[PDB]
Paper text:
Laccases (EC 1.10.3.2) are multi-copper oxidases that catalyze the oxidation of various organic and inorganic molecules (e.g., mono- and di-phenols, polyphenols, diamines, aminophenols, aromatic or aliphatic amines) with the reduction of molecular oxygen to water. Substrate oxidation occurs near the Cu1 ion (named T1 center), and electrons are then transferred via the Cys-His pathway to the Cu2 and Cu3α-Cu3β (TNC), where the reduction of oxygen to water takes place. 2D laccases are homotrimeric proteins, with Cu1 ions of monomers lying in one plane at an equal distance from each other and forming the so-called equilateral triangle.
Based on our structural analysis, we propose that the side chains of Met 199 and Tyr 230 can hinder the access of organic substrates to Cu1 ion. In particular, the Met199Ala mutation nearly doubled the SgfSL activity toward ABTS and 2.6-DMP, and substitution of Met 199 to Gly increased activity of the enzyme toward both organic substrates approximately by 5-fold. In fact, Met199Gly mutation increased the kcat toward ABTS by 3-fold and by one order of magnitude toward 2.6-DMP, indicating that the SBP geometry change due to Met199Gly mutation appears to be more favorable for oxidation of 2.6-DMP than ABTS. The kcat of 2.6-DMP oxidation for the Met199Gly variant is one order of magnitude higher than for SgfSLwt, probably due to optimizing the substrate orientation in the SBP. The most active mutant (Met199Gly) was then chosen to create the SgfSL variant with optimized SBP and TNC. Met199Gly and Met199Ala mutations led to a shift of pHopt for 2.6-DMP oxidation by 1.0 point, while Tyr230Ala mutation shifted the pHopt by 0.5 points. The most catalytically active variant Met199Gly had maximum activity at 60 °C, whereas Met199Ala and Tyr230Ala have their Topt at 70 °C. In addition, the residual activity of SgfSL mutant forms after incubation at 80 °C for 30 min markedly decreased compared to the wild-type enzyme, except for variant Met199Ala. We suggest that decreased residual activity of Met199Gly and Tyr230Ala variants at high temperature could be explained by increased mobility of the Cu1 ion environment. The initial intensities of the peaks at λ = 600 nm of SgfSLwt and Met199Gly were approximately the same, but after the heat treatment, SgfSLwt retained 83% of initial absorbance, whereas Met199Gly retained only 60%. In our opinion, lower peak intensity is associated with the dissociation of Cu1 ions from T1 centers of the enzymes, and not with reduction. These data indicate that mutations Met199Gly and Tyr230Ala may break a well-organized network of non-covalent interactions that fix the position of Cu1 coordinating histidines.
Author numbering:
A (entry chain B), B (entry chain C): 41 to 317
C (entry chain A): 40 to 317
The structure:
Amino acid sequence: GAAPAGGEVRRVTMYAERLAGGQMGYGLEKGKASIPGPLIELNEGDTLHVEFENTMDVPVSLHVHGLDYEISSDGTKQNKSHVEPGGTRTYTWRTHEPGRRADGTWRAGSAGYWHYHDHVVGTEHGTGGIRNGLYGPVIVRRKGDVLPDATHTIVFNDGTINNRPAHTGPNFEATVGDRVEIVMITHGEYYHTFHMHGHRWADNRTGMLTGPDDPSQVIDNKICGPADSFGFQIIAGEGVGAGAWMYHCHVQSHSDMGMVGLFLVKKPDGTIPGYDP
Amino acid sequence: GAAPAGGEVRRVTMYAERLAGGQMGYGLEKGKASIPGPLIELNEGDTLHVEFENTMDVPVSLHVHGLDYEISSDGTKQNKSHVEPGGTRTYTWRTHEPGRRADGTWRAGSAGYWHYHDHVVGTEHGTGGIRNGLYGPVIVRRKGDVLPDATHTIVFNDGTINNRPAHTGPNFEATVGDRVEIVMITHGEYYHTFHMHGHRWADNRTGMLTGPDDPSQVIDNKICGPADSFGFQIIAGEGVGAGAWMYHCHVQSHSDMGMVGLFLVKKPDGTIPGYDP
Amino acid sequence: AGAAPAGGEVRRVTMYAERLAGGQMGYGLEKGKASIPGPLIELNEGDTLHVEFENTMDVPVSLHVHGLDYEISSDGTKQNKSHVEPGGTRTYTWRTHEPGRRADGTWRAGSAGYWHYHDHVVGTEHGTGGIRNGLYGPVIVRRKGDVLPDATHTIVFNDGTINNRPAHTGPNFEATVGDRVEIVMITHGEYYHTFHMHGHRWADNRTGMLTGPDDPSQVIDNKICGPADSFGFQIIAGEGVGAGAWMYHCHVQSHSDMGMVGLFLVKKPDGTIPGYDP
Ligand SMILES: [Cu+2]
Ligand SMILES: [Cu+2]
Ligand SMILES: [Cu+2]
Ligand SMILES: [Cu+2]
Ligand SMILES: [Cu+2]
Ligand SMILES: [Cu+2]
Ligand SMILES: [Cu+2]
Ligand SMILES: [Cu+2]
Ligand SMILES: [Cu+2]
Ligand SMILES: [Cu+2]
Ligand SMILES: [Cu+2]
Ligand code: NA
Ligand code: NA
């Protein structure tokens, strides 16, 4: 599968809602908010109209990295781009293809692994909102990009993965040979290093080398800090086989205190060697 | 415009001077020291003789990243290349173009976003001098590099931008369509993440993709540590329009305590929609 | 300079985990000769390595490698019981592969790069004690045609030490002007660092050297790194700058002030170093 050329005007509804235990999340339908928020996928050239509604009792906003937006969709109190309690607003995101500018230089396209998050809860930089769970992934694909069999989002938010209690994953399941896309986002106060056992990727836009001329370092460990985002695709078990393959932050106290999960790679018969749950 | 081939021998006078409040700065002329220090620009092949004078009552030095220098211009006490109080010294920086060696390998040129700083005030690694403001940017351009309409230097020094009081910018002004160059240097004890709203750049030498075959990640958020330097050029307002575009460190406590500033992008008539400080 | 050949050899080596002085712990290829960092392993893409491993200590230990191909039975974790009991033995197998076009037209990245191995089970189930104690070492996998160096030096930022040495004690590395010197740089523990080399620079890519005039990788002399990061590069000692005692150090200011410093001692042909007075 390959991404097509973009150019569609898409729309979606988004809600900010309180969740259990002081948390807050984005959802695409009322009562269905999650942490991380829903995955938004666009092709270069697509436009996205996000009909947003704040269902909480405190102001919230929606700020996006990487994509084109006018200052009116910045999502900050400073620009009156926030949403009052009960309020509604339409945030508009646009994307563009790469291309040669009139001045002769190459204009980078929108394609990449991006994310959106709150910018007004607790502070005017969204410190409380991000801590509470108001973040989500955005993928913009370029014409011809390889499409995956599954996509999984891993957010290192302070000392947690996806706001979960320590030592509770998440885990992700695949079958040997699956083409698996990982979106990796970092938030909060701390730097982290993301490590995946049994697998590696290229440190470039897609995480895949373009061919024999791409000099990007191939890695299995990557330092990241607050609001960094990257992504990659792997072939599950390629050259290594089935198994419970760990991923974790490699900062030693962070892995010891529980930012660890499993990439559960199954044989075609659905079983995982060496793994007792 | 485009950078010419280099090869000139250039001279400049530089002074280290005390500034108000225990600060120290470099300057091109007596009594005009600034933090950051003056921007030095060279073309690959140029030689620069810095006629240096220490107007201060403590030793100071000038150490440069990236450029060619002999051990006698290292700027360290260890090599006896510091400057005594009231003393003078000529620091020589050289640069070179890339090219094929005899062994067939490719020698990397000097071009890049670099910086200079003190190496002896407070400690033999310049911890006091750097804290006090003794740092500045150097740009070395390759023949053919695109030249910007303006260059702005942003230094994350511990918990400050350019040693400024918290919450005091700096702000930079441009018109929609301007080609704006940012030089980004980090110093001190902390890691940071630099983020720009509404704009993005390529993670490579120039900050611009060379063309459709360049696989560098396109980003708007970059982790950086002490003595890191990078730079890029953006088209102000490209695809997003005029506005007060924030830049800040994205480490949540840092943005909250005042590591924030504004990229004020004006329409040709001078208007900035919705700006209201 | 020499060039790496195509790989595909099947090799075997013995490795031991051993206690060292001061509560330290190290890997070695011969009994009683363990070192921190552990021995440098070098493979050409396509090679297979069978590590006949023996744990001579009184605690379970493991061998976990980054980047290379290994089956789950060579993961080196308690999770899948691939650690080594006290006094026990185990064969760990590492494989590597060349890059190539898959049948579906996508490009498979090869194994080549700067990698490392370390313990994963001493103290905690992530090897916090083992790594702190010194159980780490470098692995280089070369691609056919990679340029070969005159010498290779490994620098590990482990917590606030270099190579588990006492503060301010280097290590120093010696070269002659013109030498092709390879640096392998590994980070472990709890802290981020920035590695800086005076007088020298490299390209931020797989090999540390630009492939030619079309490579847009940033050329740098300073690089941020965190726990279990690894990278490497080659420089021509003294190129364009001459002989001297060229410092390298973490550039986090308090780390350089506390002793995360060392010297790249670049000598004239007559063996002397101008300005270097110890
Ligand atoms: Cu912001
Ligand atoms: Cu972490
Ligand atoms: Cu953000
Ligand atoms: Cu230094
Ligand atoms: Cu910061
Ligand atoms: Cu932003
Ligand atoms: Cu420095
Ligand atoms: Cu692990
Ligand atoms: Cu350090
Ligand atoms: Cu330096
Ligand atoms: Cu590891
Ligand atoms: Na790169
Ligand atoms: Na990087």
